[PDB]
Every structure is written in C-alpha cells, then in structure tokens.
Write a protein that binds this ligand. Structure first.
Ligand SMILES: [Ca+2]
Ligand SMILES: [Ca+2]
Length: 211
C-alpha cells in the first residue's frame, strides 16, 4: 500500500493482435474501457468491470490489463487478501494477493497470461511483497477451454510460474477439498523472513494441534 505504482507497458502480438499489456491502470481510466463479453468466470461483465475499477481505487490495488482499443480482453488483479478469508490474518502489510487473472477464451494460447504477469512484476515494488494467490477448480472455464481439470491445472501452474509464483502446500479446508485446487506464492527478493514465516503460519494454520 505505502509504495508507489510504476506504470509499465508492452505490446504483445497475437493471431488477433496486437494487444496492449499495461498497468497498473487508474480507476478513472479503467472506467472508460469496456470489459470483453467473454470475461464472465467470476461474475457478469458489467459487475466485474465495477469490481476492477474499485480495486484500482484501493491504496495497494493494481489492475494490469490486456487491451485492444477501448476493449479489455484480459486482466490480472492485485490487492490485500480478503478480510473474511484466512490469508488476511495478522498485521502484515507485506502480504499481497494476486486476486484473479482472466483472459477471453478466443485469446487463449496467445501467452497473454504470461505477459500480463511479466508486466505486473516490472515494478521493482513487487519485490517487497510476498504475493500469494488461490485457484479453485469451480472458477475455471473447462467447457470453453476443452481441457480436463488436471491439464488445466498443469497449464495454469506453469503460467503462474512464469510470474514467479510457486505451489505451496496448505491445510486450508477450501483448497485442501480438491487436489486440483492450489495455493501459490511469489516471495519477493526483498521480503523479510518474518513475512515468510507469517505466510507459513497462514497456510499451515492447524500447526497448534502439533505444538
Ligand atoms: Ca492482514
Ligand atoms: Ca484467486
């Protein structure tokens, strides 16, 4: 939150491209764009657009977008973990959540996710955060992607790996409920051991049973 947001930009060529990959984008500017109709994995586009704008308005919030003209065909979000999920416990401002990352189905296979993550990490400020993320099978567009759950998981994980995120075991009930779900996290080069220890305490939450 206390850090400044460095705007970065790269043009990604695609079979439909080129696509402008840039951010963090301000709320004022995000409101002028239009979410592509095919970005409905979390909620309908009108509601999800309002959600991206709101996130951008947060002190720590960052919205990086994949864009063609006024049309957002993909995005990736960053903000502090949800107050009503386990990842927000304690007073640790060095823990940031990669909320979500979504890309219109027709743009799949053009490595937009990879770049979306690249441009997100171009800001040296990201090295000061431990960036965790959660992925659940029930938000994945398997029907549209044609992928089984495990092929999807393998592809999605390697995408996240390109952004520096790595899989971490957890005893979190929701994630643990299905092996395909996962917690991943990117530990910035400048992140202190205390922050990492806190993260370990969050993901292995029932340690007290064994203390
Ligand atoms: Ca907290
Ligand atoms: Ca997520």
């Amino acid at each position: 939150g206390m850090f400044e947001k460095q705007f970065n930009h790269r043009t990604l060529e695609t079979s439909l491209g080129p696509v402008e990959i840039e951010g963090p984008v301000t709320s004022q500017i995000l409101a002028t764009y239009k979410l592509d109709p095919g970005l409905t994995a979390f909620r309908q586009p009108a509601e999800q657009h309002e959600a991206l704008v709101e996130i951008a308005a947060l002190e720590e919030g960052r919205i990086i977008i994949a864009r063609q003209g006024n049309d957002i065909i993909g995005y990736v979000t960053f903000l502090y973990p949800d107050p009503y999920e386990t990842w927000s416990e304690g007073n640790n401002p060095y823990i940031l959540e990669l909320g979500a990352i979504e890309v219109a189905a027709r743009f799949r296979g053009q490595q937009i996710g990879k770049k979306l993550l690249e441009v997100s990490m171009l800001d040296p400020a990201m090295e000061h955060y431990l960036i965790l993320t959660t992925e659940y099978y029930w938000h994945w567009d398997l029907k549209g992607s044609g992928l089984s759950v495990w092929d999807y998981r393998k592809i999605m994980e390697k995408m996240m790996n390109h952004g520096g995120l790595v899989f971490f075991p957890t005893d979190d009930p929701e994630i643990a409920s299905h092996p395909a779900n996962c917690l991943m996290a990117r530990i910035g080069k400048h992140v202190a051991p205390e922050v990492v220890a806190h993260f370990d305490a969050l993901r292995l939450r029932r340690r007290f049973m064994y203390d």
